């Protein structure tokens, strides 16, 4: 992801 994932 872009965030955490």
């Given at each position: 992801?872009?965030?955490?994932c």
């Open positions: 992801c872009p965030f955490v």
